[PDB]
Design a protein around this ligand. Structure first.
Ligand code: CTP
Ligand code: CTP
Ligand code: K
Ligand code: K
Ligand code: MG
Ligand code: MG
Ligand code: MG
Ligand code: MG
Ligand code: MG
Ligand code: MG
Lengths: 158, 158
């Protein structure tokens, strides 16, 4: 069950799974057309870099929308099918905002920014869910962030 | 005033100011003897790197202890003079743990790891305060973290 007060970790995980899926899909869908059209800024660095492709955004968005159907059916909350596309967009925007910040700091495309690399999409998606009218408790907002960390390190321990 | 339930941002700021001061002091005190004795690990990277010096740790510890005297006098809570050295140590340990993680990821000494570079000392200090018996609310734990970010970006906007 998902209501407007996100106050347990399973409910956060249901709400956020479209974002997680939107964030993870571009690594398999590939892509080769950069969102930033290859633009370099006056600091010598790409605006976003090659890691952000238009095929990535579309597959991520498509995947997040499809997952929100599953979130809506699993939870009985049909609003999840309407909200999950917007949340997917926030996840995708936050991942790009993180790449933007890495480039401005001189961090080359692909080099690790620990914490930021794992949480940027979560923070964009979280921001959108709040713009949509959801209230998070701070504890469950922290737990979900740590659950994102645990699964990323869970993805790499396998 | 500082009690055992850290539940407002000013009380968190008083408790944490020794850690902030412990974390900031090594950048001026210099230092040239690495904590890691120059050891390189089998992955080819330094254990900690040159950025962690023994003079840094001592000046940081000294500074954090001195600040806890000010925290104890400002708040009327004499236990702050006893706790602030341990909290300073947690701040120093967390900053080293962050450098450790950067080296294992191939991030060279001094290259930016945004978020991690600003929060590692806060997380060590927070861990020690909880080991000491303090309870944080999640909201004030998040606020203080964002206040650390805001001041670091405040340090750089001046
Ligand atoms: N909008 C996106 C997001 C990611 N990806 C693909 O997924 C990979 C991994 O994503 P990410 O780790 O975020 O990109 P990085 O290669 O690490 O680049 P950056 O340093 O900007 O994070 C990218 O290389 C890219 O192949 C994509 O095509 N389009
Ligand atoms: N225990 C410490 C902590 C820091 N410093 C000094 O303060 C500077 C800045 O601290 P920090 O940013 O944490 O070190 P970095 O140079 O960025 O190295 P790292 O990549 O490991 O973070 C260091 O270069 C070093 O001169 C020190 O001497 N001893
Ligand atoms: K990323
Ligand atoms: K640091
Ligand atoms: Mg609820
Ligand atoms: Mg670049
Ligand atoms: Mg990456
Ligand atoms: Mg209190
Ligand atoms: Mg090294
Ligand atoms: Mg640094």
């Amino acid at each position: 069950a998902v209501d407007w007060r996100i106050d347990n970790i399973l409910e956060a995980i249901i709400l956020m799974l479209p974002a997680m899926i939107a964030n993870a899909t571009p690594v398999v869908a590939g892509g080769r057309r950069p969102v930033d059209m290859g633009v370099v800024l006056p600091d010598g660095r790409r605006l976003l870099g090659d890691g952000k492709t238009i095929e990535g955004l579309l597959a991520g968005f498509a995947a997040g929308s499809a997952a929100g159907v599953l979130a809506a059916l699993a939870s009985g909350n049909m609003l999840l099918a309407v909200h999950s596309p917007a949340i997917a967009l926030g996840a995708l925007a936050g991942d790009m905002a993180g790449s933007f910040v890495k480039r401005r700091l001189g961090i080359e495309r692909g080099r690790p920014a620990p914490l930021l690399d794992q949480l940027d999409f979560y923070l964009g998606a979280l921001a959108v869910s709040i713009a949509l009218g959801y209230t998070w408790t701070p504890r469950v907002a922290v737990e979900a962030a740590a659950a994102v960390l645990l699964l990323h390190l869970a993805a790499n321990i396998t």
